[PDB]
Symmetry: C6
Subunit: 96 residues, 6 copies
Amino acid sequence: MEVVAVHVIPRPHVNVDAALPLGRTPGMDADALGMIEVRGFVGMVEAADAMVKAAKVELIGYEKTGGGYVTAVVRGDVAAVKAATEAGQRAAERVG
Amino acid sequence: MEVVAVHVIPRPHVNVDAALPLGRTPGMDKSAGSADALGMIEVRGFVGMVEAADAMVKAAKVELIGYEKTGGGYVTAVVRGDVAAVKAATEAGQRAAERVG
Amino acid sequence: MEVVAVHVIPRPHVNVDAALPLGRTPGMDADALGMIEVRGFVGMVEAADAMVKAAKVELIGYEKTGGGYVTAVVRGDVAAVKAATEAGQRAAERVG
Amino acid sequence: MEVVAVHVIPRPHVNVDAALPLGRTPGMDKSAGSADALGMIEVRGFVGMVEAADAMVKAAKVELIGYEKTGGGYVTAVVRGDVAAVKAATEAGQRAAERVG
Amino acid sequence: MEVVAVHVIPRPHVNVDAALPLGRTPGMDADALGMIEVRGFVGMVEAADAMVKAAKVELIGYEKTGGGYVTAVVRGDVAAVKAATEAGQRAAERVG
Amino acid sequence: MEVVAVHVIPRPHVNVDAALPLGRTPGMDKSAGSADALGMIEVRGFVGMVEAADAMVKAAKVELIGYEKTGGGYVTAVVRGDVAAVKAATEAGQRAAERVG
């Protein structure tokens, strides 16, 4: 199925991790950020599952922004996040 | 009616079950100290979702654990069970949702 | 007005009544289920009113799924639910 | 502006008033021990809804009991009163909403 | 950007101020009502800012109705509300 | 990706900051007893918003105070700082959101 966006932020600003719900509140004992947004819970769950299986990342949760839009969020080392999001995108596109 | 998506994850990663509301929080068992397969049917329609969910639990030894609401009219029915049961369940649920008018 | 779906489940699975908000939690002292989904609160209310007037069913409530979508839910004996949902559909289609 | 729906139910069933948020829960009266008619104007627009609601209560002896939000920008204004008052109120509310720009 | 609606109610009914969240609950010690609805938070904020700068009105808040729709609400004397909403509409249309 | 809107208000009225969740409630300062400029990037996409927000705070001396969710998939990233910083920040955020795929 169609994906809205697949993106990697290798070194997020500390202000982004503090202000936004991305699983790495500064001070809670700088991971790369990977995100996959899908207009589809089923596609987002498959992408999330493929992400955590493809590389050493953690699924921290998901963002619901209404209208059917959900974003799976993973953190980890930059290379791992890149590998995960690539795998997650391919998995979501296979859903159908 | 039209189904948004139908999908089975045979062996969901433990992180998925820990982080998402899919009815099988790791550690929530009497023998916790191999996860169930995961079936999902997504419809832009509560009525089609309910019908899909009813068909799924009548078709196979799966547990309907709840549904997910993402807004915009979109809802997902979530079932858990053994791999083969979940595949049979979601096939029947897809067919039942196709019949809703 | 246009209706999204009109449907009857004559004998719902006990798991559906336990997991979903359909007014018959198992154990709270197997009714048929009738549902009418409308992209319109006004049309849903008219359908609900016509349903409970047309046959012996109870309106248990309604589901809001966003984007303007609402579903009226009624329970009762199978024949009554069929009669109600038929009446509710005709009533909602007359709204305009 | 465009109105989604305008509608009067002269004598809503008591089950409707008991189960839906339409401002007249059965039994909530000083002489409870015949229900008001029900007018509703639905707009994909809060501004048109407010204007409709204001026109309705200025046009007739009806009570605006609240509004219903179903997402997607959709809102419904709900008035209660005698049948004839509600019919006059909703006609004026429809006309007023048609004038909003 | 496109505005959904710009409207002024010179003398709202007391029932409208009591039943709806428009910043003038009757009894909390009859202001005109001005509203600007935008399918866009950014456009609504610019309109709101232009409104309170253009005339003697108060921004009382905003209504979120889903689907991206937000409505800024201002109160004041009729002439002030008219001047404000005219200014707010022009400001929102300039956003782009 | 497509950006819904990008906009700077150099000197937001105090009533705006008092009534809307824009991160600068009047009086919430150690020397309260001139307001920061306001930058906003709106996307129908959480991912584009996050990228926009990250670019904004890396590009200039602005504070990301939060984001606004209006449903339908729409979200707005909100930054506060001096006028010139906010203009530079939002320009970079717009460019970064344009690169998201």
